[PDB]
Design an enzyme around this catalytic site. Structure first.
Site, PDB file in Angstrom:
ATOM      1  N   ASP A   1     -12.197 -57.965  10.673  1.00  0.00           N
ATOM      2  CA  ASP A   1     -13.486 -58.325  12.032  1.00  0.00           C
ATOM      3  C   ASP A   1     -14.242 -58.060  11.950  1.00  0.00           C
ATOM      4  O   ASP A   1     -14.911 -58.214  13.282  1.00  0.00           O
ATOM      5  CB  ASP A   1     -12.186 -59.353  11.864  1.00  0.00           C
ATOM      6  CG  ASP A   1     -10.877 -59.105  12.085  1.00  0.00           C
ATOM      7  OD1 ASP A   1     -10.214 -60.337  13.203  1.00  0.00           O
ATOM      8  OD2 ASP A   1     -10.600 -57.836  13.356  1.00  0.00           O
TER       9      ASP A   1
ATOM     10  N   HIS B   1      -8.505 -51.343   5.390  1.00  0.00           N
ATOM     11  CA  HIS B   1      -8.608 -52.428   4.782  1.00  0.00           C
ATOM     12  C   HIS B   1     -10.322 -52.916   4.380  1.00  0.00           C
ATOM     13  O   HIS B   1     -10.761 -54.093   4.227  1.00  0.00           O
ATOM     14  CB  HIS B   1      -8.254 -53.914   4.628  1.00  0.00           C
ATOM     15  CG  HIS B   1      -6.562 -53.753   3.998  1.00  0.00           C
ATOM     16  ND1 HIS B   1      -5.320 -54.330   5.364  1.00  0.00           N
ATOM     17  CD2 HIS B   1      -5.632 -52.554   3.326  1.00  0.00           C
ATOM     18  CE1 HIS B   1      -3.955 -54.691   4.400  1.00  0.00           C
ATOM     19  NE2 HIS B   1      -4.429 -53.388   3.716  1.00  0.00           N
TER      20      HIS B   1
ATOM     21  N   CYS C   1     -24.247 -55.996  -4.345  1.00  0.00           N
ATOM     22  CA  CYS C   1     -23.699 -56.631  -5.513  1.00  0.00           C
ATOM     23  C   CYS C   1     -22.855 -55.646  -6.440  1.00  0.00           C
ATOM     24  O   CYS C   1     -23.255 -54.510  -7.021  1.00  0.00           O
ATOM     25  CB  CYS C   1     -25.260 -57.456  -5.624  1.00  0.00           C
ATOM     26  SG  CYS C   1     -25.568 -57.498  -7.784  1.00  0.00           S
TER      27      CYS C   1
ATOM     28  N   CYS D   1     -26.261 -55.021  -9.787  1.00  0.00           N
ATOM     29  CA  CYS D   1     -27.332 -54.624  -9.432  1.00  0.00           C
ATOM     30  C   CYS D   1     -27.308 -53.717  -8.533  1.00  0.00           C
ATOM     31  O   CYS D   1     -27.639 -52.771  -8.377  1.00  0.00           O
ATOM     32  CB  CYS D   1     -28.588 -55.497  -9.173  1.00  0.00           C
ATOM     33  SG  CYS D   1     -28.850 -55.768  -7.338  1.00  0.00           S
TER      34      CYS D   1
ATOM     35  N   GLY E   1       1.771 -57.778  15.521  1.00  0.00           N
ATOM     36  CA  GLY E   1       2.049 -58.924  14.906  1.00  0.00           C
ATOM     37  C   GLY E   1       1.546 -58.643  13.003  1.00  0.00           C
ATOM     38  O   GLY E   1       0.020 -59.309  12.738  1.00  0.00           O
TER      39      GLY E   1
ATOM     40  N   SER F   1       3.761 -58.818   9.620  1.00  0.00           N
ATOM     41  CA  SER F   1       4.698 -58.595   8.718  1.00  0.00           C
ATOM     42  C   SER F   1       4.797 -57.635   7.924  1.00  0.00           C
ATOM     43  O   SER F   1       6.732 -58.065   7.697  1.00  0.00           O
ATOM     44  CB  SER F   1       4.483 -60.470   8.259  1.00  0.00           C
ATOM     45  OG  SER F   1       3.368 -60.107   7.325  1.00  0.00           O
TER      46      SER F   1
ATOM     47  N   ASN G   1       5.623 -59.063  16.968  1.00  0.00           N
ATOM     48  CA  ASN G   1       5.998 -59.963  16.112  1.00  0.00           C
ATOM     49  C   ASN G   1       6.221 -61.144  16.533  1.00  0.00           C
ATOM     50  O   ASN G   1       7.450 -61.919  17.109  1.00  0.00           O
ATOM     51  CB  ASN G   1       5.848 -59.389  15.312  1.00  0.00           C
ATOM     52  CG  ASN G   1       5.244 -59.761  13.802  1.00  0.00           C
ATOM     53  OD1 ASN G   1       4.548 -59.283  13.633  1.00  0.00           O
ATOM     54  ND2 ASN G   1       6.046 -60.472  12.516  1.00  0.00           N
TER      55      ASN G   1
ATOM     56  N   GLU H   1       7.615 -63.153  14.238  1.00  0.00           N
ATOM     57  CA  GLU H   1       8.842 -63.522  13.988  1.00  0.00           C
ATOM     58  C   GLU H   1       9.622 -62.478  13.077  1.00  0.00           C
ATOM     59  O   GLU H   1       8.717 -60.904  13.168  1.00  0.00           O
ATOM     60  CB  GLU H   1       8.578 -63.990  11.866  1.00  0.00           C
ATOM     61  CG  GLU H   1       8.771 -65.644  12.172  1.00  0.00           C
ATOM     62  CD  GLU H   1       8.420 -65.727  10.727  1.00  0.00           C
ATOM     63  OE1 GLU H   1       8.601 -67.502  10.234  1.00  0.00           O
ATOM     64  OE2 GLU H   1       7.860 -65.116  10.020  1.00  0.00           O
TER      65      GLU H   1
END
Ligand SMILES: [Zn+2]
Lengths: 9, 242
Positions: free
Chosen positions: B93, B108, B116, B119, B181, B183, B207, B209
């Site tokens: 983002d 990533h 596209c 094309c 943040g 996992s 984190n 968890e």
């Protein structure tokens, strides 16, 4: 050659 | 986390080359999900059902249109102070840059550019965001194909080698590595903390968890990044005062 994958122990 | 936060701040304060690694958890957020990201957001899935990928994105619009939170600003502050020299993120983002971070390694990719598949026409996200906002699935304005793929790494796709190398080196040469943040269940990204651990860097993890990598961290903090990070940064400022 490193493809994104998900793995949880 | 009072003690841990203080300890984390003490490590960063002394470090000479700290690196931050962030995941989806940096943003606090039937039982089973309607859209399984390992399927709709996989390259095999996309090459078979491109519209499923976009329908999934629209359901996640709030997150895709989310704006920088206190954790992103805290991280941008640490860099400004020269304590954090690089931010490795699995996020797409661009919230780190939007918050003020400069050296951001997007493992990533990001929604910024699209192509596209049929094309090969390339596009800027700004050309489809308005359609996407009203529920209209992006389609190539040139050939009409539904295979408009953003330059983000889907499951089953290889990560960009350029970015991957720099991220690896940052981990290999940092003296402090802080996970925020994540996992740590997405690879190969999840291997970076271990590379830093191998390098002898001091390890920190914040984190919601616990993770299977927790054992290798010198300081572990359970909580929301947006609430934890600023606390750390404020304790770092005091450590840099008169
Ligand atoms: Zn096209």
């Amino acid at each position: 050659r490193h493809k994104k994958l998900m793995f949880k122990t | 986390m009072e003690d841990e936060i203080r300890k984390a701040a003490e490590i960063l304060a002394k470090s000479k080359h700290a690196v931050v690694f962030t995941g989806a958890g940096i943003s606090a957020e039937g039982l089973w999900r309607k859209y399984d990201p390992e399927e709709v957001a996989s390259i095999s899935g996309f090459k078979r059902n491109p519209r499923a990928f976009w329908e999934f994105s629209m359901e996640m619009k709030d997150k895709l249109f989310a704006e920088p939170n206190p954790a992103h600003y805290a991280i941008a502050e640490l860099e400004r102070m020269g304590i954090v020299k690089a931010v490795i993120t699995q996020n797409i983002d661009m919230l780190h840059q939007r918050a003020g971070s400069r050296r951001v390694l997007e493992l990533h990719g990001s929604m910024d550019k699209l192509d596209c598949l049929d094309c090969h026409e390339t596009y800027d996200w700004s050309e489809f965001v308005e359609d996407f906002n009203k529920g209209e699935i992006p389609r190539c304005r040139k050939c009409g194909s539904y295979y408009v793929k953003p330059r983000v790494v889907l499951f089953g796709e290889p990560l960009p080698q350029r970015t991957l190398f720099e991220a690896i080196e940052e981990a290999k040469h940092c003296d402090a590595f802080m996970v925020v943040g994540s996992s740590l269940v997405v690879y190969p990204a999840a291997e970076l903390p271990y590379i830093a651990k191998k390098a002898g860097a001091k390890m920190i993890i914040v984190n919601a968890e616990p993770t299977m990598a927790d054992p290798i961290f010198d300081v572990k903090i359970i909580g929301k990044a947006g609430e934890v990070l600023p606390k750390i940064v404020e304790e770092v400022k005091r450590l840099r005062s008169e």
